[PDB]
Curated annotation (Swiss-Prot):
Changing residue 231 to A: Strongly reduced affinity for histone H3. Significant decrease in interaction with KMT2A. The keyword Ubl conjugation applies. Changing residue 77 to N: Strongly reduced affinity for histone H3. Belongs to the WD repeat WDR5/wds family. Changing residue 289 to A: Abolishes histone H3 binding. The modification N6-acetyllysine is found at residue 82. Changing residue 257 to A: Reduced interaction with RBBP5 and reduced ability to stimulate KMT2A methyltransferase activity in association with RBBP5 and ASH2L. Changing residue 103 to L: Strongly reduced affinity for histone H3. WD repeats lie at residues 13-52, 55-96, 98-138, 139-178, 181-221, 224-264, 267-301. This is WD repeat-containing protein 5. Its main location: nucleus. Interacts with PAXBP1; the interaction is direct and links a WDR5-containing histone methyltransferase complex to PAX7 and PAX3. Interacts with HCFC1. Component of the ATAC complex, a complex with histone acetyltransferase activity on histones H3 and H4. Component of the SET1 complex, at least composed of the catalytic subunit (SETD1A or SETD1B), WDR5, WDR82, RBBP5, ASH2L/ASH2, CXXC1/CFP1, HCFC1 and DPY30. Core component of several methyltransferase-containing complexes including MLL1/MLL, MLL2/3 (also named ASCOM complex) and MLL4/WBP7. (Microbial infection) Interacts with herpes virus 8/HHV-8 protein LANA1; this interaction regulates the MLL1 histone methyltransferase activity on viral DNA. Changing residue 208 to K: Loss of interaction with RBBP5 and reduced ability to stimulate KMT2A methyltransferase activity in association with RBBP5 and ASH2L.
């Protein structure tokens, strides 16, 4: 069994490299962030540009949605995060504390907390309602490349160019596990069931780990990833797929269990820096760097 993803829309508008794309939890919207300091909102099913959200002073590396699809958080080189009301475009809060670029961000499932990681090598946990920093974790010894809450928010996983992945107890901020040769870890996230973590390293390798056992369950290879923080995803709506961008301008799709490449999506004209999987439909969003600057939407039958 193989997917048959086909190009449906090319979304243009960002004026610099795109950095991240995320589908709203209710499936209705795609949000994109860019080095052009802008967030853009697009319709997930017709590709129609909806709006631009501006306010950050420098480029944006990441955006994430609240669970009710009403709020966005953005992480910027201006050392802040911003909480936005998607409906109004208004900045509700500016999260200040990091001493250097904020690279990654995420709400917890409750969406009362935000987790952030920064070039300043720290992970921060923030109160959505007040905008106050609740905890600062001395998480890593190099820039933090990704932060992600597990299925119920009990745990955070972080990745860093220092070569480490770490599991943190959200409530206490204590490091429960450190996964340890150490190529830079450019991305990480929890699996759908919360038992595994998917980590990308800058040696063209994706790895599925049982972090409790410290055992590598799966390895996915064949793509190019030696430089950039490139998101990876679990595709849960049809076939069980792993999806990632690549520095050879392609979208790679692997069979979760067999690790075989089942599809490569051709079309972008620069590094595919970010991919996202729609929560209910077999739809992928892909986004590329500044020779391209577009987002593409792809649809599969399975
Ligand atoms: C038995 S299975 O085929 O259902 C299976 C489920 C998981 N669980 S998971 O990664 O969280 C996950 C991924 C995706 Br995509 C969709 C749903 C989902 O639950 C992991 C594996 S493994 F990859 F660990 F054993 F090596 F093959 C196998």
């Amino acid at each position: 069994v193989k997917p048959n993803y086909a190009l449906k829309f090319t979304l243009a508008g960002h004026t610099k490299a795109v950095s991240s794309v995320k589908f709203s939890p209710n499936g209705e919207w795609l949000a994109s962030s860019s080095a052009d300091k802008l967030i853009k909102i697009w319709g997930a099913y017709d590709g129609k540009f909806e709006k631009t959200i501006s306010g950050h002073k420098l480029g944006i590396s990441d955006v994430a949605w609240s669970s009710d699809s009403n709020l966005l958080v953005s992480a910027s080189d201006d050392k802040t995060l911003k909480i936005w009301d998607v409906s109004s475009g208004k900045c509700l809060k500016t999260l200040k504390g990091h001493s250097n670029y904020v690279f990654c961000c995420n709400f917890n499932p409750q969406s009362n907390l935000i987790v952030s990681g920064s070039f300043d090598e720290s992970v921060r946990i923030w109160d959505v309602k007040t905008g106050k920093c609740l905890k600062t974790l001395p998480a890593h010894s190099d820039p933090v490349s990704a932060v992600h809450f597990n299925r119920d928010g009990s745990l955070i996983v972080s990745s860093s160019y220092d070569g480490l992945c770490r599991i943190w107890d959200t409530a206490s901020g204590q490091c429960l596990k450190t996964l340890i040769d150490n190529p830079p870890v450019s991305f990480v996230k929890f699996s759908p069931n919360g038992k595994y973590i998917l980590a990308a390293t800058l040696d063209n390798t994706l790895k599925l780990w049982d972090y409790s056992k410290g055992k590598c369950l799966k390895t996915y290879t064949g793509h190019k990833n030696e430089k950039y923080c490139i998101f990876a995803n679990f595709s849960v709506t049809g076939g069980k797929w792993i999806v990632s961008g690549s520095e050879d301008n392609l979208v790679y799709i692997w069979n979760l269990q067999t690790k075989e490449i089942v599809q490569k999506l051709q079309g972008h004209t620069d590094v595919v820096i970010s991919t996202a999987c729609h929560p209910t439909e077999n739809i992928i969003a892909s986004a590329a760097l500044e020779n391209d600057k577009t987002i593409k939407l792809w649809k599969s039958d399975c």
